[PDB]
Curated annotation (Swiss-Prot):
Native organism taxonomy: Bacteria, Bacillati, Bacillota, Bacilli, Bacillales
The name this protein goes by in its record: Thermolysin
Obligatory cofactor(s): Ca(2+); Zn(2+)
Keyword Cell membrane carried by entry: no
Natural source organism: Bacillus thermoproteolyticus
Assigned GO CC terms: extracellular region
Positions annotated to bind Ca(2+) 1: 57, 59, 61
Free-text remark on how the cofactor is bound: Binds 4 Ca(2+) ions per subunit. Binds 1 zinc ion per subunit.
Protein origin, superkingdom: Bacteria
Binding-site list for Ca(2+) 2: 138, 177, 185, 187, 190
Thermoactivity: Thermostable.
GO BP term (any one): proteolysis
Name of the gene encoding the protein in the UniProt record: npr
Length: 316
């Protein structure tokens, strides 16, 4: 809509209070004009028709429990925008400030969120397995990172290429968690998964086998479920990103950690410069080793730790 840039306030899924960029024209719209061609948040109103209606509010106050998922979808899209702009000099998901569109209240009891090729979609969950999935900054950053991947490497959402795709989304989901610096971790979806059970998560990068995901190439899933295990074989790359950042010893291979900034730079460079739609794990190692070499030189600790990390999860 055409209108005035303004600042509203509301509560997120977790009851946290935050300010949100709105646009005034009769109603206050969840439209942020401060970021590229803007960030727009829509109400799917418990239906599967997309995007639904641009989120509208009479008083610019978003404190109803109905409002909570919209507040987080809108705010965490902004933090994610800021991360790619400030840390990687990237303007929105397409590199040219494309409008970022989110719909919340998708379907009834929907225990998922997705990038549909055009926009992000968040369910409310059933209240048991999930609460509203926009509540997780790692979830919002994960789904918008699918958009980045689609406009860069274009990794095919199948087999090894699909697993790298899933891994990139978990890596950048987590680095956006750390950039926003609330209670960041190396787990995926802890904030919105199983509200009755504390301490658990959907997936773990630090120890993927905790949730039944392989942490070594030799334990890879080769069946057809989950498009050839895109959410499963992602553990092998997830664990490698974790060792590169934090270090550790895994099946007796020692890796010196180089921290989150360097991990980000290396994997962003691999994503935008070397990876292709059909890239496998082996070509991801080569891409990640070339990126560290470009950035830090062939003889650096940074290149050594990428090599030791890919060695540790059994990727030659
Ligand atoms: N995003 C993962 C986990 C979601 C929870 C399962 N309903 C997937 O779709 O496989
Ligand atoms: C839930 C979310 C992180 C994603 N759609 C899976 O994995
Ligand atoms: Ca209101
Ligand atoms: Ca957390
Ligand atoms: Ca997390
Ligand atoms: Ca839980
Ligand atoms: Zn994903």
């Amino acid at each position: 809509i055409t209108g005035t840039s303004t600042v509203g306030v509301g509560r997120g899924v977790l009851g946290d209070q935050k300010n949100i960029n709105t646009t005034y024209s009769t109603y206050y719209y969840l439209q942020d004009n401060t970021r590229g061609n803007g960030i727009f948040t829509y109400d799917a109103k418990y239906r599967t028709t997309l995007p639904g209606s641009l989120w509208a509010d009479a008083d610019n106050q978003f404190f109803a429990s109905y409002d909570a998922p919209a507040v987080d979808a809108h705010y965490y899209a902004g933090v994610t925008y800021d991360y790619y702009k400030n840390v990687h000099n990237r303007l929105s998901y397409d590199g040219n400030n494309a409008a970022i569109r989110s719909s919340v209240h998708y379907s009834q009891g929907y225990n998922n969120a997705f990038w549909n090729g055009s926009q992000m979609v968040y369910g409310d969950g059933d209240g048991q397995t999930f609460i509203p999935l926009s509540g997780g900054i790692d979830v919002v950053a994960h789904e918008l990172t699918h958009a980045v991947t689609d406009y860069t490497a274009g990794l095919i959402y199948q087999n090894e290429s699909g697993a790298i795709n899933e891994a990139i989304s978990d890596i950048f989901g987590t680095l956006v968690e750390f950039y926003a610096n609330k209670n960041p971790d190396w787990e995926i979806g802890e904030d919105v998964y199983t509200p009755g059970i504390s301490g658990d998560s959907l997936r773990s990068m630090s120890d993927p086998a905790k949730y039944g995901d392989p942490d070594h190439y030799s334990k890879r899933y080769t069946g057809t479920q989950d498009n050839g295990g895109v959410h499963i074989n992602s553990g092998i790359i997830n664990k490698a990103a974790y060792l590169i950042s934090q270090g550790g010893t895994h099946y007796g291979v020692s890796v010196v950690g180089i921290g989150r900034d360097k991990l980000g730079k290396i994997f962003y460079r691999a994503l935008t410069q070397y990876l292709t739609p059909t890239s496998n794990f082996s070509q991801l190692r080569a891409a990640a080793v070339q990126s560290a070499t470009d950035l830090y030189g062939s003889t650096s600790q940074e290149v050594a730790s990428v090599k030791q990390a890919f060695d540790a999860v059994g990727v030659k």
